[PDB]
């Protein structure tokens, strides 16, 4: 189904270069990408997710343009935007079911 | 300096077998200030003058006048603190007369100086204003 | 020391310009050979000599005569190698044998112990010198390299520091066996500013040191002048005067970029802009390729132009920054101002669109030109080209904006220069690595690039290269350009094979010696055919080694991203000085509008003054997100980085969503319609 | 210090706890929501607190509601980061026999506040009929100084900057004075769990 | 379907295979303790014949399996039921064993302190008793092994032992033979026993010939030659006790003189001994000797410090404190209430016990043999550590000497235990100790009376430091209540000797340090352990090298060493610790042992001037050669020059080098000779381009134009890498021999720097000195001259071969390296 990658903090493995790249080869009907020492077969509807413990991380900018960044940083204003929604759902529960 | 509870109980217990030696003849304060002071908090002390200090304390409260009463605190000569070493009588007064010295805390009871409070008080402070900074959130948020 | 007792000086000259001649008693003045013009095609192999370069010469051989090792210590492009490298190829091959050892970083006490026992024979006993008494030079270049290790101590250096005194290298299998090591001379040549800035002064010590010093203004005139001169009297008999006017300016030029420090200086971000006699070599390469026929007549404005886009072209390709650019145009603008002096008209020589390229004369059919095209000509030639290489090798489709059409104008040039290996740096997704490609099939040139697995060892890399190298040393041959990446290279060790090739002709020990007197065997029969001498088996080999180096052009594409080239470059000297750099900028926003409008092409849109329209606002995001980017730095430490890859790969995103969307809604309202 | 560390999970607890003791029916719910939820985020955290750091939390609190403007105080950005570091600035020797060096020299970085600009020249004219005669006095915070610089009374925080630079022995009881003053419901913040 | 029964198979198949390894291994251990032991056999009759009833079987059902090799055809659950039996049949026959090596340390509480491998091994050869004697160096503090009478049968090894010998090889014979009877913990126990019977016989042959050699024609120092180290040291300090006792009786008389007369006397016999370790002696009577030394220059310093303070009575505490030994037969004996009355002598009540007093606590002497261990310097601050340690004995609670590492807090606990006669076990816990090793350690420790220093204690795991918390807790809490059998945590009813003690020697500022949880804190009496004074030590080295006036030249040289790290120009290639003090007082040993009537002043002026000097840059030559002017204000000092050989390197350096024979020359090359003659491993440095090789290089063209062939193998050592030098094993384990090395033992003998007539053999290693390179070669740069290997091969360096390391700068160098050359 799905592969979550945790700690990865910077200097993507380059055992994952191969995969990192969207680009798989088509190899007549069953397609087949070579990841590692030995291509294995890969099929559709997988998904990679990379996430990052890392406050204020740093990344080659190569790896930054082939894989998408997205920052879920709670910080300033982004709490006081969750709490009201939290608070509006407890104090006025009537008109938000 | 770790100074625990057992480090008194430890000096209490050599103070007993040393008081049940000697009973009716007269008490050994010169050779049980050194156990006292050099032994129980050698342990602790490396810095050799927090030693001279330790004993100086110990030298001043351990003497014959002991037995009379005596200001525990150390120079007051003409200043009014006067907390004395009980007299004989039941064990419930001596708890009494430690509740009976002015609750108001001065260093004067160290013999330190009432003005090495007015430092303590600058350096709690300096203290409260180092560790603000350091917590101190997002440098305003710029303007 | 003219506070020199009784023997006085001549005044107007320096202590050094002055030998005492014992016929005559009076301190003459070194005297220095007027060049001749041979038709050397590798210009590394062109040597004019200056009064610096015979006064050198004599003291090399003073510290020949004598078994003395010298050392010669001045900045990473200063001449010290050429004149070694003149001095050992003048010698007489029964007195003398001369090998270059090119220390890497990575020369370790073992490697070079396995080549000083490959040069040195077996004497009687346990003694290893020349028989016959010959003298063996074992030329070290690059001394300051070798890796200093944590405590500050280079394993090769102390090795040398075994050799010099007690003469007595232990054999490295079988370590009881002393080896007693006679008749080798050292020639060392330390750069201070690279490595190790000094060697342990326990050696410096047992060498004789003697500085080459920084380009002065009569060096180069005497140098670059003579070249010139020489290769003018060809051209024309008019456009001499030219000569001296053009060399003044590259020299004006040239000295008012080194006075200021503050813009181009060699600092840890700028660790490329070493500019030192290798740019005003390539410099006046640039201009000896004035062929007679479209060059002679009225010379006033046609070489002065060729000169502006030789001079930029190795100068503006080095720079980062768009203010050192800026800079760089001033001074090329007072350069033509005084020395060529005539300000030809309100317009200037120097100009935008000033591109010179000796591959479009070719195609027209037209012999041997590197006469300036204009931008169309340029853009009808390369887009014939791409479609010539789309058809024959594996497609690879790109736009040719006006920038990436300059690119394969200025790779084309650094492989058609022989012996000149490029060096393109740019960040990864730039197409560096597809414009070269292209650049290779332009030029009559065939790519070899490795192709490297997940588990790749040193001795696999050993024989893709051995490969390639059975390909060059065959005679009728089609110059192999060698194609290298940042993701080619998997481990720091691959490029020390690379950093050879790359420095001189062929990699030392690629071959048993067996196959290297077959591959000399093989071009006996083209030698012949050329008129150079044969069965000498010294400048045969030295002819072979020549056409290597001419037939092997090296083409590595780096990224400076994390200073992962500022550290090879630090640790093998080739990469940097040896090479060509062309540097890869982020796309223009005149470009970034036509990539667009190329991929929108074949989707539909109502009125066409859309898709126009879309491929404005598809540039703009992208220019937009880098003045935020810029802003995000500033106000936060929070890096991001875009990417011309990263602009490619969303044309493809909206291209590939819009169809979805559309194909969704033309699915609804069919239903609709079908229904009403 | 370690073991002071609290989950956002735990935190988001005892802010709905706070919200769900509200006993206010919409009359000012919003403003008497806001004081319930600042005492039950300060005692949870308190308990944790060892003797020394209680006072510096409910600092924090103050001086982070200043800062975003919560509660109305007259202080201005370079007078807060002045209050919080003290820069000593040594070049004039001239002093009175009272002060100490330490204190003059934290003048001369105060007189870089626009507001304390003229503070020096004031403090040389009447220096021992005026400041001598409150620098002496015990209690000075709830005392008055008499050059009229009564105005620094009538403004808690910038009075609070005073005392640092000239008596700092008496601030911790003059900041506990300044919190109860200032901050809503302070005097039930500063005495918490006696 | 065919998947999931294939991981079924696979299932099977990991049990089976995991429960032969699990038997295997457990079965190959227990077989090996079974094998060649016909005592251990006899011993356990019962789960000895059930465990061959388990090996027959396991031989046999390996060869039914050896048909059916794979996995696969072999795993059956009737074969994992099987070996599921075995491994429940091994636990009784390992739990068999476990619960019987426990019955004999029980009987014999020393075996708890070896190894559980080493106790098998002596247990198994119970009938040899040479094997069994070897191990008791582990058991004990001296006595390695015994002698023995050879015996009536050559095959037998002989049962009769006619002495004892130290770890030293000192000899202490027993008055008669004593036997080795059957059971080894039976004979062993005897065997610890008599051991303390000579030791205490000998004492009362002591003190009865001590009071005699006052008056009697044999002086103290020839008396001193008759006895052990241990005896002959006790029957000093029991006459020292007697002579103060005998001057507080005067001075409670009246005669002032008393103190002065005590202090003239004991400080006569220190200046006497100390021209006894002058005049060329044994290298055990030495420390005999030396040992006395230490403890009378203590006694001196007591007895000085008593006339200074002026103290004129007995049961002050400046008496009381000081470790006295008395000789009395106490007819009112207290001791029986003190501690518990153990050996029969102690019981007896009409024969002399030596008994041992310090500020109320008073413990007989626990006879057990120490054999010529060196005594430490008794300084002011160990003087403390005593009362501390022996207050925390007589409080029931251990004692936690603590400090800086290098002060030695393991070493002093170990001397006052070695004074007091007990046995001090060492243990150094390597956060590896688990519940049931130290459980072990304790149980032992409890039951035979000695006292557990734990090196490094700071570094156990705080799990099982709680543990030890609740074990300690439970002995200490049963010496209170003086339970003579006590319940311990598991294994409950065990013996408590009195006399047991406990410290925790705690390295405060250690990283990874596991602090006490306070529960433990409390049940240890802590102690502030400081470096010891670089003047006490000195004092001691200088009395060791025959030196009368030692304790004024030793305040003079402490001053010297201390100021020169301030005042000169700090360089690394100085060594002003006591290392280096150590090695120039050796050489004024040897120029005092040449020329005795000399005063003592301007010999060792002489000494510290030149051998500091050719140390010493030319910028400090002049500020260094002022400052020895201060410390010795009026002595002249005269150059010793070597007259022979400054004229023969004159001649080699002109004649066969060629180079100029320059004043400054010679001087560098005499300089290096005397080094070389005394310091195996020299350091010629210097800047890069000076005579460094010339000077070496003349030196040996002198030990060839005077002595023999002097020949040398000069390796660059940083040139080779550090595997390649030494040697290592390559990808077949075959050692390739490295280049220092096989020159270490080409040079032994067969090559060209063989042994025929070779006076001066040496390597020179002219690298920079790195700590990596110079890691491997430590062995041989300290004292030993002996090289260790990665192949455990040795090379014993001889005597008549040196290291001269030719270095610029020691910049990378440690500042150990530096001192051991
Ligand atoms: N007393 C002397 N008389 C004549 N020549 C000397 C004398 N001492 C040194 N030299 C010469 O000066 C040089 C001294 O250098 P040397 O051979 O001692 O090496 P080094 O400097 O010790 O080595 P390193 O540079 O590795 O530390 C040699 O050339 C030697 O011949
Ligand atoms: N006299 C000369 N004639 C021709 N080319 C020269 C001369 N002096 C220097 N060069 C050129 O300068 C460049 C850089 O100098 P090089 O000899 O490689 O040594 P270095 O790395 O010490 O500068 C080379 O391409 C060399 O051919
Ligand atoms: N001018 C261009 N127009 C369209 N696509 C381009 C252009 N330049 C580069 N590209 C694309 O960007 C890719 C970059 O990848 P690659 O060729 O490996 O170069 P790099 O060396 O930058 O990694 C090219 O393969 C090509 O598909
Ligand atoms: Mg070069
Ligand atoms: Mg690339
Ligand atoms: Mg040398």
Same mark, same amino acid.
């Given at each position: ?97 | ?143 | ?94 007195? +003398? ?30 003694? /290893? &010198? ?82 080459? /010093? ?44 080194? %006075? ?166 740019? +960040? ?91 591959? +000399? ?40 991203? &994390? ?67 810029? %802003? ?45 | ?70 509660? !109305? ?31 003059? !020299? ?35 915070? !709830? ?52 | ?228 180290? $241990? ?141 010529? =261990? ?72 409890? $039951? ?62 250690? =990283? ?22 670089? =003047? ?34 700090? $360089? ?15 050489? =004024? ?210 005597? $008549? ?21």
């Amino acid at each position: 189904r799905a592969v979550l990658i945790e700690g990865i903090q910077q200097e993507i493995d380059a055992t994952l270069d191969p995969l990192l790249q969207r680009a798989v080869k088509k190899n007549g009907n069953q397609l087949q990408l070579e990841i590692g020492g030995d291509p294995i077969d890969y099929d559709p509807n997988f998904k990679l997710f990379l996430m990052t413990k890392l406050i204020n991380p740093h990344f080659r900018p190569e790896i930054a343009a082939q894989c998408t960044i997205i920052n879920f940083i709670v910080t300033e204003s982004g709490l006081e935007e969750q709490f009201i929604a939290m608070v509006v759902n407890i104090e006025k529960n009537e008109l938000e079911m | 300096y770790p100074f625990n509870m057992g480090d008194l109980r430890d000096s209490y217990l050599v103070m007993n077998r040393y008081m049940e030696q000697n009973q009716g003849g007269k008490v050994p304060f010169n050779d049980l200030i050194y156990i006292f002071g050099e032994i129980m908090y050698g342990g602790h002390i490396v810095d050799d003058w927090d030693r001279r200090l330790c004993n100086s304390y110990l030298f001043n409260t351990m003497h014959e006048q002991l037995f009379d009463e005596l200001e525990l605190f150390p120079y007051i000569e003409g200043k009014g603190l006067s907390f004395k070493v009980p007299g004989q009588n039941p064990y419930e007064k001596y708890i009494e007369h430690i509740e009976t010295s002015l609750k108001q805390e001065t260093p004067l009871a160290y013999g330190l100086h009432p003005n090495a409070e007015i430092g303590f008080r600058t350096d709690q402070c300096k203290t409260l204003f180092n560790t603000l900074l350091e917590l101190m959130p997002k440098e305003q948020s710029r303007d | 020391w003219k506070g020199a007792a009784k023997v006085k000086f001549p005044e107007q000259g320096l202590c050094y310009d002055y030998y005492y001649d014992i016929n005559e008693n009076k301190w003459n003045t070194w005297k220095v050979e007027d060049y001749l013009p041979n038709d050397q095609p590798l210009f590394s192999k062109i040597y004019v000599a200056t009064i610096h370069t015979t006064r050198l010469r004599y003291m090399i051989d003073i510290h020949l005569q004598r078994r003395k090792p010298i050392l010669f210590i001045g900045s990473a492009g200063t001449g010290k190698t050429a004149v070694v490298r003149d001095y050992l190829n003048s010698t007489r091959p029964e007195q +003398v044998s001369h090998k270059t050892i090119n220390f890497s970083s990575f020369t370790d006490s073992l490697a070079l112990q396995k080549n000083i026992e490959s040069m040195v024979e077996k004497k009687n006993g346990r003694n /290893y &010198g020349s028989a016959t008494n010959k003298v063996l030079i074992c030329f070290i270049d690059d001394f300051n390299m070798p890796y200093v290790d944590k405590y500050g101590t280079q394993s090769p250096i102390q090795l040398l520091r075994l050799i010099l005194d007690y003469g007595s290298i232990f054999n490295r299998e079988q370590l009881e066996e002393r080896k007693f090591l006679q008749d080798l001379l050292f020639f060392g040549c330390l750069n201070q500013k690279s490595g190790s800035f000094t060697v342990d002064l326990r050696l410096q010590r047992n060498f004789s040191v003697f500085s080459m /010093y920084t380009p002065s203004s009569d060096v180069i005139k005497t140098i670059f002048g003579s070249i010139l001169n020489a290769h003018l009297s060809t051209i024309d008999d008019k456009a001499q005067k030219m000569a001296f006017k053009l060399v003044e300016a590259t020299y004006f030029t040239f000295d008012k970029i080194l %006075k200021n420090t503050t813009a181009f200086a060699p600092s840890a971000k700028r660790f490329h802009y070493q500019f030192n006699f290798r740019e005003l070599a390539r410099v006046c390469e640039g201009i000896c390729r004035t062929t007679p026929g479209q060059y002679s007549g009225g010379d006033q404005g046609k070489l002065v132009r060729l000169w502006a886009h030789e001079m930029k072209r190795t100068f503006e390709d080095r720079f980062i920054a768009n203010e050192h650019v800026e800079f760089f145009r001033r001074y090329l603008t007072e350069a033509i101002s005084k020395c060529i002096g005539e300000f030809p008209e309100t317009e200037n020589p120097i100009a935008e669109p000033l591109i010179f390229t000796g591959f479009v004369a070719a195609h027209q059919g037209l012999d041997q030109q590197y006469t300036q095209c204009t931008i169309p000509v340029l853009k009808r030639v390369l887009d014939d080209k791409l479609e010539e290489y789309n058809e024959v090798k594996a497609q690879m489709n790109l736009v040719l904006f006006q920038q990436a059409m300059e690119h394969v104008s200025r790779i084309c040039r650094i492989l058609d220069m022989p012996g000149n290996n490029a060096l393109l740096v740019g +960040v990864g997704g730039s197409g560096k690595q597809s414009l070269c490609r292209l650049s290779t099939f332009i030029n009559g040139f065939e790519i070899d690039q490795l192709v490297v697995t997940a588990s790749f060892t040193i001795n696999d890399l050993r024989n893709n290269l051995q490969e390639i190298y059975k390909k060059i040393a065959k005679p009728n041959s089609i110059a192999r350009v060698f194609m290298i990446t940042d993701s080619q290279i998997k481990e720091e060790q691959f490029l020390i094979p690379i950093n050879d090739m790359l420095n001189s002709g062929w990699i030392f020990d690629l071959f048993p010696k067996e196959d290297m007197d077959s591959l +000399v065997s093989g071009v006996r029969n083209e030698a012949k055919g050329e008129g150079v001498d044969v069965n000498n088996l010294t400048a045969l080999t030295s002819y072979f080694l020549d056409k290597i180096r001419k037939n092997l052009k090296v083409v590595l594409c780096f990224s400076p991203v &994390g200073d992962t080239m500022r550290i090879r470059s630090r640790k093998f000297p080739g990469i940097i000085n040896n090479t060509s750099i062309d540097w890869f900028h982020p796309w223009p926003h005149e470009a970034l509008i036509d990539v667009a409008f190329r991929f929108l092409e074949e989707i539909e849109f109502p009125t066409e003054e859309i898709r126009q329209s879309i491929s404005l606002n598809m540039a703009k995001v992208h220019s937009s997100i880098d003045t935020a980017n810029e %802003k995000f730095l500033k106000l936060e430490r929070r890096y991001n980085y875009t990417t011309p890859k990263s602009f490619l790969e969303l044309i493809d995103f909206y291209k590939k969503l819009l169809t979805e969307k559309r194909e969704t809604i033309q699915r609804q309202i069919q239903r609709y319609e079908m229904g009403l | 210090d370690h073991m002071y560390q609290y989950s956002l999970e735990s935190f988001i607890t005892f802010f709905f706890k706070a919200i769900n003791r509200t006993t206010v029916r919409d009359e000012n719910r919003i403003p008497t929501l806001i004081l319930n939820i600042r005492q039950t985020i300060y005692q949870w955290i308190s308990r944790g607190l060892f003797e020394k750091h209680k006072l510096i939390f409910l600092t924090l609190i103050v001086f982070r509601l200043m800062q975003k403007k919560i509660i !109305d105080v007259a202080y201005e950005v370079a007078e807060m980061d002045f209050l919080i570091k003290c820069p000593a600035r040594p070049g004039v020797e001239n002093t009175l026999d009272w002060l100490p060096n330490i204190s003059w !020299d934290q003048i001369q970085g105060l007189i870089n506040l626009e507001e304390f600009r003229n503070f020096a020249h004031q403090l040389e004219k009447e220096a021992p009929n005026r400041f001598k005669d409150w620098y002496n006095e015990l209690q000075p915070e !709830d005392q008055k100084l008499p050059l009229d610089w009564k105005r620094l009374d009538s403004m808690p925080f910038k009075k609070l900057l005073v005392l640092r630079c000239l008596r700092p022995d008496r601030m911790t009881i003059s900041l506990n004075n300044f919190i109860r003053a200032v901050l809503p419901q302070g005097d039930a913040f500063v005495e918490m769990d006696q | 379907d065919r998947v999931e029964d294939w991981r079924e198979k696979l299932g099977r198949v990991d049990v089976v295979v995991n429960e032969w390894l699990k038997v295997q291994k457990n079965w190959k251990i227990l077989y090996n303790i079974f094998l060649l032991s016909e005592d251990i056999r006899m011993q356990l009759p019962e789960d000895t014949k059930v465990f061959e009833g388990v090996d027959k079987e396991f031989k046999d059902m390996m060869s039914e399996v050896s048909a059916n090799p794979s996995v696969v055809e072999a795993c059956t659950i009737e074969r994992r039921d099987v070996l599921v039996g075995w491994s429940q049949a091994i636990k009784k026959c390992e739990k068999a064993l476990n619960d019987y090596l426990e019955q004999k340390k029980k009987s014999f509480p020393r075996f708890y302190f070896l190894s559980n491998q080493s106790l098998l091994t002596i247990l198994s050869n119970g009938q040899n008793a040479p094997k069994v004697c070897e191990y008791l160096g582990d058991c004990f503090d001296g006595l390695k092994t015994l002698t023995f009478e050879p015996p009536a049968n050559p095959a037998e090894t002989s049962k009769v032992g006619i002495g004892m010998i130290s770890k030293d090889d000192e000899k202490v014979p027993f008055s008669s033979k004593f036997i080795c009877e059957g059971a080894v913990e039976h004979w062993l126990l005897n065997l610890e026993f008599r051991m303390r019977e000579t030791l205490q016989e000998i004492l009362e042959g002591a003190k009865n010939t001590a009071d005699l050699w006052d008056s009697g024609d044999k002086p103290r120092e020839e008396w001193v030659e008759g006895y052990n180290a $241990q005896i002959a040291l006790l029957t000093t300090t029991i006459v020292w006790t007697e002579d103060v006792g005998r001057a507080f009786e005067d001075l409670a008389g009246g005669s002032e003189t008393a103190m002065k007369e005590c202090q003239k006397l004991i400080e006569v016999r220190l200046e006497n001994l100390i021209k006894k370790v002058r005049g060329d002696l044994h290298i055990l009577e030495r420390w005999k000797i030396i040992n006395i030394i230490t403890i009378d220059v203590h006694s001196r310093d007591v007895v000085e410090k008593f006339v200074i303070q002026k103290v004129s009575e007995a049961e002050s505490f400046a008496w009381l404190s000081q470790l006295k030994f008395y000789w009395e037969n106490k007819p009112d004996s207290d001791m029986h209430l003190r501690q518990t009355l153990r050996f029969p002598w102690e019981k007896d009540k009409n024969k002399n016990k030596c008994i041992i007093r310090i500020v109320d606590w008073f413990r007989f002497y626990s006879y057990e043999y120490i054999g010529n =261990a060196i005594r430490l310097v008794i300084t002011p601050l160990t003087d403390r550590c005593y009362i501390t340690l022996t207050q925390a004995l007589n409080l029931t609670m251990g004692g936690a000497p603590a400090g800086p590492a290098g002060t030695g807090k393991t070493e002093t606990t170990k001397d006052l235990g070695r004074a007091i006669g007990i046995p001090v076990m060492v243990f150094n816990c390597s956060d590896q100790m688990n519940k049931d090793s130290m459980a072990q350690i304790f149980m032992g420790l409890s $039951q035979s009376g000695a006292w557990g220093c734990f090196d490094e204690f700071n570094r156990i795991s705080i799990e099982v430091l709680s543990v030890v918390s609740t074990q300690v807790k439970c002995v200490l809490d049963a010496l209170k209540e003086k339970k003579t059998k006590f319940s311990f945590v598991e294994e409950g009813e065990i013996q408590l000797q009195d006399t047991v003690g406990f410290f925790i020697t705690m390295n405060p500022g250690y =990283a990874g340090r596991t602090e006490l949880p306070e529960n433990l804190k409390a049940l240890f009496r802590s102690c502030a352990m400081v470096v010891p004074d670089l =003047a006490l030590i000195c004092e001691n080295m200088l009395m060791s090298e025959g030196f009368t006036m030692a304790r004024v030249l030793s305040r003079k040289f402490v001053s010297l060493y201390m100021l020169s790290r301030e005042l000169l120009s700090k $360089q690394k290639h100085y060594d002003w610790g006591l290392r280096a003090v150590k090695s120039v007082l050796r050489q =004024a040993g040897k120029l005092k042992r040449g020329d005795p009537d000399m005063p003592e002043d301007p010999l060792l002026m002489r000494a510290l001037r030149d051998f500091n000097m050719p140390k010493i840059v030319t910028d400090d030559k002049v500020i260094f050669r002022r400052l020895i002017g201060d410390l010795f204000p009026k002595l002249d000092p005269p150059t010793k020059q070597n007259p022979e050989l400054k004229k023969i390197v004159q001649d080699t350096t002109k004649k066969d080098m060629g180079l100029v024979a320059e004043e400054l020359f010679v001087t560098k090359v005499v300089q290096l000779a005397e080094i070389l003659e005394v310091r195996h491993c020299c350091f010629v440095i210097g800047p890069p381009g000076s005579g460094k090789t010339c000077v070496w290089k003349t030196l040996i063209k002198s030990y060839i134009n005077s002595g023999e062939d002097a020949e040398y193998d000069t390796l660059n050592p940083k040139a080779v890498t550090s595997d390649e030098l030494f040697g290592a094993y390559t990808k077949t384990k075959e050692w390739k021999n490295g280049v220092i090395a096989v020159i270490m033992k080409n040079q032994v003998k067969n090559e060209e720097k063989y042994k025929a007539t070779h006076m001066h053999k040496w390597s020179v290693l002219d690298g920079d000195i790195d700590p990596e390179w110079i890691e491997s070669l430590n062995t041989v740069m300290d004292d030993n001259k002996v090289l260790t290997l990665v192949s455990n091969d040795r090379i014993f360096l001889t005597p $008549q071969m040196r290291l001269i390391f030719e270095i610029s700068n020691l910049r990378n160098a440690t500042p150990a390296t530096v001192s051991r050359a």
